[PDB]
Symmetry: C4
Subunit: 350 residues, 4 copies
């Protein structure tokens, strides 16, 4: 009755996020321009760069999805749209030179209907995107989609534990998306108290997925290009970015001047305005960054430099060999520029 | 023995911002979980919220509106013995609502308690700075002897020893919290306290052996803190600042810099005690929030979402099964929204 | 092959006031009835555990007198001539037989300065140096005990049990603890040296208690609860600089800035203090005007009584031997202060 | 194998602000301690200070002034081969002073070294972002063969394995620091680094088994961080930001908000390299006046720290000094606190 070991273990676990750690440099024979950044998600899915633009109404529509795929990445068309209008976006990406494209779908009554229209437009992956991927409703929906479409790429999320990954994998998902609470615009951890520090979530989830040969997506909480290197080194095959893309020219929306420079709307899909309700995100603005190619060049540039530092010729080597070292707040403050007034902003550091 | 000398600095304590709730398998949607809670057979709440017994939080108006939302209001004691009984009668005659009243450890304790009993109080709150004192113990023992079936809520404590003492004195409910209050300076002027999450857990650990519920009182700033407080062992939470700005709290609206505010002060501040001193609280202001129903709705909404993430169909499952993970300051900064300029405030996040 | 000091370089861990809280315990005693008296030596006993630091912006004659009349002690600083310090000592003693101390450095004329101070009937000399664990201090302690066998000798500053042992065997009957915590101090920034003050107080009290010798917890106390923690860590008495520097009896006058009154407060290792090529170990600043010393002492003694009440301590020896701490994170400290509410009025004990 | 999978998050690292030095018994007065240091028999310094090889820190006037203070300046490599050999010659002509020069791992690296040796350079710094790479190792091995008596400082590194490899390639001094720089963004944009205090200690642990010194390069904001670096194992420290504001640094002064400033930027920044992907930023630091005044405060802090540690010389500090770890609250206790600062101190801003 009172035997319960769960009571004494409540505060046992410990979690790390990007700003808690650094990558330990290692012997390198390979130059950053020489490393390989390709990644294989499935038999039918493979990215030249391990970057995906989030399926949010302020980040990824067709224009973003086309530019992402042209960079070697992938864009997830968001679902705050009609089924008719979302299938229309997917085809536009497909007829534009054989580009890859993904589309977001929820766990709803009309989900399979939406999925039917998406397969008709030749989408390469559907994203079964929910706030709590570790639920029977997601589980049953993955199983439902897999029975009708045995060869369709299914990305299921979001989860943050090894048990949740195993469940989604056994339900039929071929890619698992990791991240509960880390988002730049996300308040889930504050209003519900729920989450796992993102780097520990990647490691714990990839640890389980590794046993099934299934890739993991690190989704959210990435603020600099160095965070992407940590996430890939923590076990994930690919990262999903929201904030770092919302200011790019191809994302939906126009430019507005705020505090003298150009800005674009960036808001969570669980925010009040996006849902038009106890919300789990906010609405905001990120600086305008210009064309997507410039942001992607800096992102890949940081990944190439990071891989050079770790002697990792490809991302698999980085996943299996890279070591981290933990630091305190004083480590983080030493790691950023410090004790100097920054005069010009770098393409890398705002 | 040098046992007390060698153990001075061994203990470690956690507060709300040190931890997150680990997601778990869920078969339940937020709209279907139960938020009801039983403090005693004659004291049952449909929502796990009590409005603090302070002169800027709970009078009759606050107690009635709290009771209609399914919660409980503690009418504060900075008034005459009779006017407190009228407020009690006003609530009881206002639809048979549950209502509580604060009592101190003083000479006129029994007269006031007698007047509250004649008015049909449903619980008295023996409210003191140091619940683990012989004066509290003696008075609880004295009150249980006169009223063997009256609900007695005693506090405040923060150790298993203090909880065990008050339970053996006769209190059916133990209130936990030394120093975490938003307006509180006890830990700064006196150096004394325990981080509230460890305190709730330490006290609940002892209280669980007796089948005695505990209240998490003070330090809750967002709806997610309540989920952690209930997940750490508390049956119900008591809030001061989260309620002080609502329409039903005592006090007119104050106008500051063109906006609406309400006075909020500790019962140990200079201003509250005049109705020389060495205070343990401060005097302040919180923004006006409107009607109580909206704040409760956001609070319950966040709890419901949290229970869904933790797979908790009821609060008992949350108490016995929810697990935490500890995080650094870097983890807390990842948990809030970050690196985006916030445009509009959310109903959930000011 | 033995690499023992090499492998131990980063082993130790230290705590200060903002890292910990005092754990409340069973109490039968009301704050208004606790005893805050403390005995440093047979000839030096204080009714309240408070000493004003020997700095030229904190303690001169008026400050030591108001401190003594409250049951505490004032250390008159040595940034004055020998004659002028002896006159200041004389003024305190001729002002009702009050206790008074005086700071002395390790110099050639230290013995000369000490001769004049003892003649003026000083109650304690404070052998004040930056690095109490040095041969010059020790030999000077040994030299003064030989000439003045019944003289109260306070020696500092130190931060280790070993340093405590050395000064005690040299002959000091009181040891003063604190390397770098001072509000105006930069020793740890410019020199890289120090020990977190709560760890320093506990480590030195661990050694000094074996000899039956008290320690003074000196510096780093910013709020009244910090005094409770330091006494709970083993100190008989605490020494304060900034919390007293703004008081009426402190030397210096009040300046007005932005409508509020301030007083100058500077480290004795600051440029200005050495003025009346230099690598200082302090800075110069201002603290708020606080009015008469009695109000500050009342909040200070009042906060301590509240703390001892929470700890069930009828006397300060009980607090020293029994009080327990719990460690907390930065998030613990943010919860401990007032938070998430706009503070409207200034509290008498919280600014 | 899961061993590497399992060991990803085992290590822990400390930086300057995580620690304090524990005072120890002193029989030595601060003004009598020795701050002389020996990097090699042909390279001996009166003070353990080296000015970084950056285009905003060290040119000829800086290196001459560093040597005259008892230190050393590394002439930066963002100039032509002739322009760098000429500056090395200029320092030598100013009284037989010591001077060092930075070289990259490039095709024309050997050509530049030949000119620096003809100018009688005392040490070359084979300076790279990732010293633990085959290109550096191969470049070090051939330089040791051609110039067997040349002082070779190779960097940068942050692990013992990297230190051991650079020593086996032939370098007599190892330079430690990946990411601690005030103008550095490597750890943010590449995700890679080792907290500078742990990196110095890890590298000094390995180098000392060979009798090889290490230079603690970067991350020093106050003179007490320097005492920590030497107590953590480095023979000498290298500074960029604490030296760029002096009169002798390259360039002139700009006026900002009523005060005087000097440009300070990383060598991996856009401006120094001029699509590029930077690992540094561009900035400004306050003007400080002559080098002698900044050095005086720095060595003064070193003397005080050694005294507190009872270290009569720097060897004793390296072999005996102890640390104690502290949290952010200790660090806040360590700085001035709860007092409004009125006047600027010569060593604390
Ligand atoms: C990205 C975010 C955060 C997000 C994005 C948009 C909207 C939301 C809202 C604010 C609506 N928040 C939740 O929806 N919160 C939530 C919490 C717990 C559970 Cl258990 C839950 O429902 C689960 O059960 C359903 C079937 O299994 C499926 O919807 C699954 O999410 C939902 C969140
Ligand atoms: C909510 C707070 C904090 C509070 C609320 C109102 C007033 C106070 C003030 C500032 C007046 N502070 C105390 O009152 N401080 C205190 C401290 C230690 C002890 Cl030991 C103590 O007395 C205990 O023993 C007595 C006999 O049982 C009983 O009164 C019990 O409080 C009181 C605090
Ligand atoms: C409150 C402070 C910090 C303080 C107060 C006044 C002046 C100073 C200055 C700025 C002058 N700084 C030192 O004086 N720094 C220092 C550092 C190491 C040593 Cl080892 C040292 O000397 C020791 O040895 C002598 C006896 O042999 C004796 O002077 C003793 O302090 C002095 C500091
Ligand atoms: C002070 C800094 C940081 C620095 C200074 C100047 C320029 C750079 C730039 C921005 C150009 N960034 C790199 O250069 N990043 C880098 C990352 C990984 C590797 Cl593996 C790498 O190259 C290694 O392989 C080469 C052959 O040995 C050799 O150059 C060695 O460094 C370079 C950094
Ligand atoms: O409103 C929301 N609440 C919680 N998470 C969200 C919300 N909107 C987007 N997200 C998540 O946050 C990620 C983007 O995070 P970012 O890259 O840190 O800006 C998305 O890919 C989603 O996984
Ligand atoms: O003035 C006081 N000093 C210390 N604690 C107080 C004082 N007044 C109320 N409290 C406690 O602090 C809590 C404040 O709740 P909060 O605003 O939610 O943090 C109250 O519910 C009491 O338990
Ligand atoms: O300039 C100095 N440098 C370092 N420490 C000092 C200096 N002057 C005074 N102190 C110390 O700091 C204490 C006061 O610190 P406070 O009470 O925190 O302001 C004094 O009693 C001395 O121990
Ligand atoms: O642009 C760069 N990126 C990264 N590190 C740099 C760059 N430029 C110089 N450094 C390093 O930073 C050191 C100076 O750092 P500081 O003394 O802390 O400001 C130099 O000695 C180099 O090791
Ligand atoms: K840096
Ligand atoms: K977040
Ligand atoms: K508080
Ligand atoms: K300090």
């Amino acid at each position: 009755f009172q035997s319960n070991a769960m009571w004494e273990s409540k505060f046992v676990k410990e979690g790390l996020t990007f700003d808690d750690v650094l990558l330990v440099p290692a012997k390198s024979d390979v130059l950053p321009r020489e490393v390989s950044v390709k990644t294989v998600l499935s038999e039918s899915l493979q990215l030249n760069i391990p970057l995906i633009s989030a399926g949010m109404d302020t980040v990824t529509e067709a224009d973003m999805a086309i530019a992402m795929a042209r960079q070697g990445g992938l864009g997830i068309i968001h679902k705050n749209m009609s089924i008719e209008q979302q299938a229309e976006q997917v085809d536009k990406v497909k007829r534009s030179g054989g580009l890859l494209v993904g589309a977001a779908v929820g766990v709803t009554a009309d989900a399979m209907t939406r999925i039917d229209a998406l397969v008709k437009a030749s989408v390469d992956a559907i994203v079964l995107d929910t706030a709590h991927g570790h639920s029977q409703g997601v589980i049953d929906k993955v199983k439902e989609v897999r029975a009708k479409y045995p060869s369709l790429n299914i990305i299921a999320g979001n989860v943050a534990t090894a048990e949740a990954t195993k469940a989604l994998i056994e339900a039929g998902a071929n890619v698992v998306k990791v991240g509960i609470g880390p988002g730049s615009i996300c308040t889930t951890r504050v209003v519900a108290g729920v989450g796992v520090p993102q780097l520990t979530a990647v490691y714990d989830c990839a640890t389980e997925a590794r046993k099934h040969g299934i890739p993991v997506i690190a989704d959210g909480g990435i603020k600099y290009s160095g965070d992407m290197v940590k996430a890939l080194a923590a076990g994930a095959h690919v990262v999903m970015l929201g904030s770092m893309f919302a200011g790019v020219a191809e994302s939906p929306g126009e430019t507005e001047i705020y505090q003298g420079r150009q800005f674009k709307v960036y808001r969570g899909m669980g925010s009040v305005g996006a849902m038009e309700l106890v919300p789990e995100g906010i609405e905001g603005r990120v600086p305008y960054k210009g064309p997507l190619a410039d942001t992607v060049h800096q992102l890949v540039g940081g990944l190439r430099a990071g891989m050079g530092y770790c002697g990792a010729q490809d991302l698999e080597f980085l996943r299996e060999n890279a070591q981290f070292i933990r630091m305190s707040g004083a480590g983080l403050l030493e790691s950023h520029p410090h004790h100097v007034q920054i005069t010009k902003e770098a393409p890398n550091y705002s």
